[PDB]
Design a protein around this ligand. Structure first.
Ligand code: GP9
Ligand code: MN
Length: 424
């Protein structure tokens, strides 16, 4: 078992990258605000429906002219755990499981998570806020193992009928109430806001909608237009509130889609909406779910690096100025010159700058045309993808952090974490 951990640690060493001196430590002990966009795909960016921009605020952020650096080639790497898989990868730089939910199944594994590292190295307190109850996706148990200090679940918000739709709290009230809670917290904090309204089947009361549905005939695609606009408006007002509360200028703020919202079941309607046949290659392209990051003292822009959610943890750690040599991570720092531009997907497909590998076939990213003669680096990349998934799975299945005496990590005692019922 210890030997199994050793094999994984040795494997994760080669990819390690040095921080970019332009970015190294620039956000040390600054508040970090992390905003989850439920089911958000970047095909929405700059998309109009009936002449209206679906997501006008995110469109502005994606210009690069609004203090955020936008990554247009950024992919979720999730499976059956959906939001829970995204959360798992974002805070650990590990993959979820190939079947089922790592949160549900591995919630009492030992972890060396991002929030715990920030707490230990720099005195952060970490929190999650979400307008649903705490034991969904086993979050209550998992967060204690991740070393999250506070969980503002649905008991912290008014869950009356007027404030809820679909799975729980409406995003607009969620963001408003959440900014109010953040204003009352001691710095430095690491705060993760998990949204909810832009979730299958994508239903929104007419009174709350500010855009008409598309007319594809597919209720899922047509409804998605409205819930995406609603989320964009919710986020815009949230950013305004941060400015009013003095929580904008000196915070790291990152924004990310958790995973795709529209499956291949909806290919007929998506062809109508996007004006292009949804081939397997095109569907892979549509798994772009976006990353936006604002860093104090840095201007925004557009960074075309191909990347995945596994890369977020080492990025944040390097921004804080924390040495990552001893952390078992599969991702690499987005701003580092040596960033590894290979993005494994959970099903064994993958993407690189130049090509994608989808259901056993290779396509050029330029035109999604089939590539007939193997790229020089293909076998190397395919081996990396397969081994990354196997090695990550070995950590989870073997609960291998039990055996890691990490000099840069103090073992979490999960029993020291408790999330009290909120006032509402
Ligand atoms: O995992 P999902 O289905 O994307 O999101 C659902 C929730 O976060 C529920 O609280
Ligand atoms: Mn989700």
């Amino acid at each position: 078992s210890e030997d199994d951990l050793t094999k994984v640690l040795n494997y994760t060493k080669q990819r390690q990258t040095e921080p970019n001196p332009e970015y190294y430590g620039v956000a040390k002990k600054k508040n970090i605000i992390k905003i989850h966009l439920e089911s958000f795909q970047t095909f929405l960016i700059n998309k109009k429906v009936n002449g209206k921009e679906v997501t006008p605020f995110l469109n502005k952020l994606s210009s690069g002219k609004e203090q955020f650096t936008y990554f247009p080639n950024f992919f979720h790497q999730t499976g059956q755990g959906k939001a829970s898989d995204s959360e798992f990868t974002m805070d650990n730089s590990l993959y979820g499981l190939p079947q089922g939910s790592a949160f549900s199944l591995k919630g009492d594994n030992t972890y060396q998570s991002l929030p715990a590292i920030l707490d230990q190295k720099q005195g952060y307190k970490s929190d999650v806020m979400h307008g649903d109850y705490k034991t969904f996706w086993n979050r209550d148990q998992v967060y204690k193992h991740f070393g999250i200090d506070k969980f503002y679940d649905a008991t912290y918000y008014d869950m009356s009928d007027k404030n809820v739709v679909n799975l729980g709290l409406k995003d607009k009230i969620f963001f408003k109430d959440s900014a109010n809670y953040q204003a009352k917290m001691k710095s430095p904090f690491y705060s993760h806001l998990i949204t909810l309204t832009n979730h299958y089947p994508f239903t929104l009361d007419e009174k709350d909608a500010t855009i008409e549905k598309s007319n594809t005939g597919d209720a899922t695609v047509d409804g998605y237009i409205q819930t995406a606009r609603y989320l964009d408006e919710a986020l815009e007002e949230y950013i305004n509130d941060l400015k009013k509360k003095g929580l904008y200028d000196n915070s790291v703020i990152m924004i990310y889609g958790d995973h795709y919202g529209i499956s291949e079941n909806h290919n007929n309607a998506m062809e109508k909406l996007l004006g292009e046949k949804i081939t397997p290659a095109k569907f892979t392209d549509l798994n772009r779910t976006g990353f936006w990051i604002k860093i104090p003292g840095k201007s925004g822009g557009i960074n075309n690096e191909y990347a995945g959610q596994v890369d977020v943890m080492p990025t944040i750690l390097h921004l804080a100025g924390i040495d990552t040599k001893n952390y078992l991570m599969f991702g690499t720092d987005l701003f580092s010159k040596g960033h590894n531009q290979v993005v494994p997907f959970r099903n064994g497909d993958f993407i690189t700058k130049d090509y994608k590998y989808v259901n056993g076939k290779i396509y050029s990213n330029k035109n999604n045309e089939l590539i007939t003669t193997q790229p020089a680096d293909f076998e190397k990349n395919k081996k990396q993808v397969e081994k990354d998934l196997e090695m990550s799975d070995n950590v989870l299945n073997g609960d291998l952090f039990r055996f890691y005496k990490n000099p840069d990590f103090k073992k979490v005692n999960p029993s020291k974490y408790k999330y009290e019922t909120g006032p509402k």
